[PDB]
Symmetry: C5
Subunit: 287 residues, 5 copies
């Protein structure tokens, strides 16, 4: 028995089904308890700190001073962006939640009247607080205690500390408008990667769409709030030239503002106004 024409399948969907899946995934978040949501947020912040530690080491390897005289920072930023996007798989496969992707899904669930306003506020607040706690706890308990980013003062050995120092100094000397714009550019890629895993239901789609999206915002110099929380806190721990005021006021607050603006307004409102009738037709056919 020979097979000539096998069964035709597909693992992709259209934009209407992807919007409906996004609204359903966003409205499922408001039904968990506070401790379940908090533990998920802490785990996701810890995974972000894990992959950003691995990225800092992989980038600081290519920040060797003789190579840095020839190529500058190009290979270090490329290898950082190459090895960072596994954090998306770490978060999605454990079922945890991060604030940056929530700014689209839970907000569009709020637009479709699936989540009330107080439930929306507590979901976003618990998500941001738990992501912060997981990021700083990985920054101290693994990254600081392993001594990987310690200043060792010799130029042929200090490329890990020098890469962390130069990255932390670069992302702390923007103005307010510049940091808001870079954070907007980051969270558009992040929410699009959430749309990618809601659309493409295979392992190849999951791995490589979010690989190219997360690598793309990483090499662009765009600003991610949870990654910046980890990076600026481990920079403050190992005594980089930045200040606590510089890290929290000059980077973290406009990064939070720009990430929320890109999630809730730049992407959430146009997609809601494009696809709300399809969610209406989906909800009427279930009655």
């Amino acid at each position: 028995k020979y097979v000539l024409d096998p069964v035709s399948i597909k693992s992709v969907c259209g934009g209407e089904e992807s919007y409906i899946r996004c609204v359903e995934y966003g409205k499922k978040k408001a039904h968990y308890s506070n401790l379940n949501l908090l533990a998920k947020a802490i785990l996701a912040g810890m995974f972000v700190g894990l992959c950003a530690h691995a990225s800092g080491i992989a980038g600081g390897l290519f920040y060797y001073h003789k190579l840095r005289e020839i190529v500058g920072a190009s290979m270090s930023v490329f290898v950082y962006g190459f090895t960072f996007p596994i954090a998306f798989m770490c978060i999605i496969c454990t079922g945890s939640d991060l604030f940056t992707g929530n700014t689209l899904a839970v907000t569009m669930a709020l637009y479709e009247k699936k989540v009330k306003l107080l439930d929306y506020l507590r979901v976003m607040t618990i998500s941001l607080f738990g992501n912060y706690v997981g990021a700083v706890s990985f920054a101290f308990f693994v990254s600081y205690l392993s001594g990987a980013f310690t200043n060792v003062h010799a130029v042929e050995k200090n490329h890990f500390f020098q890469f962390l120092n130069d990255i932390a100094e670069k992302k702390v000397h923007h103005t307010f408008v510049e940091c808001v714009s870079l954070a907007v550019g980051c969270n558009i890629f992040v929410c699009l990667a959430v749309y990618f895993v809601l659309t493409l239901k295979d392992g190849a789609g999951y791995v490589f769409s979010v690989f190219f999206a997360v690598y793309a915002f990483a090499i662009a110099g765009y600003e991610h709030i949870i990654a910046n929380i980890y990076t600026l806190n481990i920079a403050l721990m190992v005594n980089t030239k930045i200040t606590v005021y510089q890290a929290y006021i000059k980077n973290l607050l406009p990064t939070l503002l720009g990430n929320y603006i890109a999630g809730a307004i730049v992407l959430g409102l146009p997609l809601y106004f494009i696809y709300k009738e399809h969610y209406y037709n989906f909800e009427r056919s279930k009655r």
Copy 2:
């Protein structure tokens, strides 16, 4: 219970089914309202500007002057072409429409008498205008306001502005025939990538066929109208050596002409004459 011979599947189709899917996807566009189509076009232009900002930064990293003395522009153009093709996934997963892919699908729907001429004209006009608006709005509100491409005048720091300046000067000193030929070569790859996502219905097919196609036209020096709108407008904003007349007359108008010629004539008419009887047999079996 052990499985020795699993169920045989396929996620690909033939050329006849791919043509029929292209005509159906093209004729669905003329049934949306004007504001739905306009919002989709603005979102697609914004995504093009997003990924082209990320590509300009990733390419300008490898345009460092000591590396530029050794390798020229090769690594910068390669890294640009590597990080650009995620815009296709950004456009297809949100259900938005871009003019360059529309020049094949809506035109072959017009050839098969599925779209009237006035509907075809308003679909193409609204698509081009919305793509323009989204591209210039990302060029100003993110790219210009973040200061990423500002001339900083020091040769060890100015590689982002110098890469944008050299790219903008290169794509503005073609003659008319040269720019039309390069735009034809671009839109053939673009419409083939649209055929790829109409044929290969997995995440791997979606990601990597359009990766290789879009990278291929990006490294070839071929001219894309929406990408050129973003690039020449952000070049005009940060005071590159190009002129407004040079950008709009010497590049953008022959790029528009060559892109439409490749979409509607070079690819649309041969595929229509090859496969119109299969669309006839498909439409007769639905009666």
Copy 3:
């Protein structure tokens, strides 16, 4: 409701089913009309010229003279072989036909008495003539008119013309036996990639098996007749040191001979003698 053991699938087949699919795909070609087959052949030659233009530009970028003093031609040939294999996807997704893959499938359909001899001759002749016409038409109307491979005489700018010149001079100074052997080595990879897309029915199989096969013959220095038609004609257009006699007699005729020998004899006759009883059992079970 939780899923622990999902449905077991497969997207691959055995050698018997792959042979039967090859004979069926080969015998479908003799039932198209002459103009349908001619338009498909012209489109496939045009796609080959498209991807070979993109490969020549991508390779000539890494043929920069300061990099060429250090690495030679290695990175240019690697980047050429990296960016060439998208032509296979361009040909298969539009349903067009190229002569090199036809030398296996239509010949094994002739061995199984599915195609008569005159039908076989007109299919192969129309395929070769249309592939030639599409290749030279892309060489003139896009590649020559865009000025991408023009001799500009300055050594820091002339790397595109110099790469085309050195490639065209290398593939024109073989003897007859050497060119026949390299063409045999090329068409074995080409017909194996046709077997790969007949066996592996996903997007990942389609993209990456023919990626590794086509990259493998491209970096090996093996000779492809349609790619050589494009390359030697664009080399003759931009006034490379080669002669018309050298291009047509010293390369193109032994490349045609070696490609047909590898398709019809080296691969077609052993696979026919191995698997003809399985095609007999397949054809008897349909009665």
Copy 4:
């Protein structure tokens, strides 16, 4: 007959199903006999030693002294991390078990009262002992007897021994807290890769999720107990500057402690407390 809308599939699952699959896979381990479990553990340790030999050779190739003066150790560590992750596929496709992944699955099966404490202890002990035996047996019978890492004393030829020596000296001069932190960071990636293969049921998911995870911990400098057993034993065999006391007390014992802490506590307890009600609902619906 044309197919326009194929059958929609998925090869991924949610976090609840992934937790349930993890608990089931962990509780299946306590039902094998002692010799079956011992042979599986010996095979897995042998596969780890195989892929780490291949990684040491691939890394020592790029540790050539003239390249080492320019780039340092960056390309060697990158090529090591590139070629190491095939060990995961070697272990999963033969059905063998490694201690590092067991510290999550069997421990969460113990938390859900599926495994008794004495059965848990003998499973973990037999796993660790067999993994040790397989690693040292590959270190002697293949790696030492092939002479690949012998000190040959000439600086242009000694890059394999020098890479093994520098790696072994680097991972033996940590303090206790540093080694525990790096081992925690390793086993979080390892247990996440186990979650990846429990979630993504295709070949692409299997290959590339664990590729990016295992490459990520390899380039980060994180400490894996079985890989360190192989590496420090082959370093002791070929007379690297390290001591037996240094290898066993300064690296192997805190690596074992940190790997068990990351598997059982950092990842097992939060996932258990998040998802134990879903395992309760799964187990009640089977009655």
Copy 5:
């Protein structure tokens, strides 16, 4: 009609099903006739010679003397290992058989009493002889006659011959124990790649698992008997410094011994003793 939860699939299997598939695939080989098996073995040896020619050219490109002064042999061996693993797809998609993978499957079919001893001996003998004949016939009729590896005596042009000469001299100066150990390390990867294609039934699994496995043994310096037959015979043809006695006694005989030992004993006996009861339960449920 919108799809929210598609049908859950999987393309992977467990270790028991993979063992059963291996025993069935191994016992199918003893039912072919002698000429069918001989033609399959000759085709597989020819494919090995094809991909090893392409690998020798791709590696000798990066063996350019100015690059060789900086990086040594690292990039040449990496590019060789990158472009070699397409031979596995060439062999599996045509249904042919190679000796190295047969040493596991046919031997475990012999352990399960599915193949008699004389049938086992003639299958292994015909496989080895046909693989030899195909390898030497490709070495002469394509590789030698194309002149690609001819000594041209000028150091800026002789990198192909110099790469072949240095590889052939390296793999001929091992002792007996060293060559046996390296051959064992090779055939473990080869038989694991056979297990990979028996387990992962997609195109992505087929391409990339055997890509990473075959690249891993290629960059490790492990010894493959059929690849060494091709390489040492083309080295003897183009007058490399090696001798016929050195090639056949110092490399080929211990490579054959180590490959058979790794296939039949190191991997076949533990997997047989682990999984023979599952094959018993599979065979009893078919009665």
